[PDB]
Subunit: 448 residues, 2 copies
């Protein structure tokens, strides 16, 4: 399988989802789904961008260059464990990833056997907060303990006390929802029908979903979906299938947030929905970089040739990788500004990329103090040591954000409430309609 | 980490639980608790013994010899996940183990990456039968869907329409039940109340079960149980705790079994119940072998020194494997005859072993025709092939039973239907009252 490499004195491996998950029947041979941009190409071009800049910064790791081994995760343990095994066949320092929470349980379950620290940026699951099993796991994002705390608080808000709960099957959906289920049970929140599904269900299973969800009404009008991105798409997909809409008010975890890949197209039904989104400041910096990219100037990232063929439904033939599921050629001069939208979670990954570096720094100051570069004490890099020296590191984010980790592993997290609707210009836009910091819920009644 | 090795032509690696798992805090360091003879030593000495009787048999594996690489599993996914890595680095043909499904997936998740065929004898969850996920997993034991499929049949046999389903929270119950559930919607069995109880739950919630179950009467005197025995005792506890006896009828899976350490004290409230006892018959030969064991001469199995002292609470002075606890040194001539009880799963263990040999054997008939030992096509062993050679393999057991595997990877099932009644003596016995033999039930319409 193809890897995006970059040499360096230090090597930090990472796992980004560059293709969608593998189709059902192909999971044994592990042929991954199609290419992505937001969870995929941007996160690879972002892992690079921030690493060229880190290294060129005279302050952090003055005479120590950083390298990485970026591999594809496909949002699935097998492809993940596959690539994770490739790290142990220079030896990696730390791993950034993988995509899903559940996946990480798999990713580190193995890493901790070689004492390799791991920093997540999208795993909001709670199970990870436990370090006895996943000792070497840490993240720059906050736990669902908070996110589940507020989703329930967004409910009390409008006097709703009858609401179903659908959750994406896995370790992400179990942990978050079980909480949303304990919390409610304290507040004496009665819940209607409850059910879960696999993000890659048969279009036939989805319909069953809406059936059971519609077979119980009109009491249960509002829904809690602590659910994966497409998992919601699929529910909408069924919505359209049954040609009915405006029936429920959904409430999606950051699985939705303000993504378009979810409602791109199916806008007709995903309205009035309420979403959660960790308040990651837009990375104004990244965009200046992304756009300027070319088909032939970017060689380090092996996926571009394929990624490009898709962003324009054209094709560059002749070179090995080609997508013949199309007709027109490429102008050769396509511009990325067309409908471009920076990954929502984009911020975190960059920072987490920093966190991994700071550790190296705080350690260097500790084990090879007064030395120009790396030293005998630092070759090789002792894992357990790079750990401690991590939890204990803290700095200003890539864009004005305090970033640090508590003893357990988790970090500081806060999110805003998003709403999707029809603005003035003919367009379904995601609208900011309230925020949530430490139990305190702030929405904008007038903006809704 | 200590291993029990044996040299031969083909090495079949295995994972037995020889030590209890390490407590949570001690886990990141892998300090597995105490040595286990029940699910531990009796098997290691059984993995050794069996392989002996096979190299003793001139009918099967005539000139090819089986050797073993037996590693400790600690009934945990990490000490097992660890030892499994010691496998991928003569190489191992097939893995026997481990004992728990929670563990099976973790391991099998890895093994399937390098094409190692794995045969389990203890894992029951339906999760594994989904052979996309684990193409290389197979077992000589039935799946729960099968064990439940019979409980669904002890019910269809009496035209009981409404029923309740309680299952111990976690793997054994949640896995088996989720099947008792499908089968019932498919055959028209309305479920009245389904609820989960962690074995170690309080009387508070252990009681709430009763209040909820009874609430759903008398249109449902049948409470189903895919529970763990303790979840069952606890239910009885509340029974006598509230004053009720003989209200409803329970059907307990092999979790309860015809065990006697489940009804002590609470006998009166449990009479009338129908349980599922997985027929594991006994292996005289093992016992003839185990007993005649001596500390001085069993060197292949490195744990015996550790094992011996524990079993007899004595010490080998000045020896590595030493004990500070008790001080009565060992005579060297003590019989295990004291309270000895043959592992209740020993059979399965063994039938797995054999299976792993038949495959090699039957494969070498095909890939190595007319050749005496191993012929080049088998040097080295191609696992992806050994798989098709195993799956389509079949023999008689060590009890007379017949073994084989369906396409998926699952085997048959044989079940004894036990009923608890008041004997002709001042005691209550688990009376044998019928059997479920590979798709077929046999009830006694006047023996209940």
């Amino acid at each position: 399988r193809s890897v995006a490499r970059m040499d360096g004195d230090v090597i930090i491996g990472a796992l980004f989802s560059v293709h969608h998950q593998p189709p059902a029947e192909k999971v044994p041979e592990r042929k991954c789904g199609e290419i992505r941009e937001q969870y995929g190409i941007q996160r690879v071009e972002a892992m690079f961008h921030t690493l060229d800049k880190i290294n060129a910064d005279p302050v952090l790791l003055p005479n120590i260059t950083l390298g990485s081994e970026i591999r594809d995760s496909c949002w699935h343990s097998s492809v993940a464990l596959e690539q994770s095994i490739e790290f142990i066949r220079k030896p990696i320092a730390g791993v950034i990833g993988p995509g899903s929470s559940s996946v990480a349980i798999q990713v580190q379950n193995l890493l901790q056997l070689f004492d390799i620290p791991q920093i997540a940026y999208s795993a909001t699951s709670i199970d990870l907060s436990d370090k006895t099993l996943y000792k070497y796991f840490l993240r720059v994002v906050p736990s669902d303990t908070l996110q589940a705390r507020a989703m329930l608080d967004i409910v009390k808000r409008y006097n709703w006390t009858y609401v179903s709960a659908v959750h994406t099957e896995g370790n992400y959906g179990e942990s978050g929802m079980d909480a949303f289920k304990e919390l409610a049970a304290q507040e004496g929140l009665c819940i209607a029908h409850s059910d879960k599904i696999y993000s890659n269900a048969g279009e036939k299973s989805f319909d069953r979903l809406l059936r059971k969800l519609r077979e119980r009404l009109p009491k249960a009008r509002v829904v809690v979906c602590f659910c994966e991105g497409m998992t919601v798409r699929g529910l909408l997909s069924a919505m359209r299938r049954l040609g009915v809409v405006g029936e429920f008010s959904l409430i999606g975890s950051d699985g939705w947030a303000d993504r378009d890949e979810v409602i791109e197209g199916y806008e007709v039904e995903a309205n009035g929905g309420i979403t959660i989104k960790l308040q990651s400041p837009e990375v104004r910096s990244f965009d200046d970089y992304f756009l300027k990219l070319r088909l032939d100037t970017n060689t380090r990232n092996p996926w571009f040739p394929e990624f490009w063929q898709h962003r324009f439904q054209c094709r560059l033939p002749g070179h090995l990788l080609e997508n013949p599921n199309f007709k027109k050629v490429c102008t050769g001069n396509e511009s990325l500004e067309e409908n471009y939208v920076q990954d929502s979670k984009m911020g975190f990954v960059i920072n987490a990329i920093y966190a991994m570096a700071h550790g190296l720094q705080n350690m260097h100051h500790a084990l090879c103090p007064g030395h120009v570069g790396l030293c005998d004490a630092m070759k090789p890099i002792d894992g357990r040591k790079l750990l401690d020296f991590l939890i204990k590191s803290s700095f200003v984010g890539v864009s004005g954000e305090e970033v640090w980790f508590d003893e357990k592993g988790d970090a500081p997290g806060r999110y805003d409430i998003m709403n999707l609707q029809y603005t003035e210009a003919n367009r379904y836009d995601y609208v900011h309609v309230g925020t949530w910091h430490e139990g305190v819920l702030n929405i904008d009644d007038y903006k809704i």
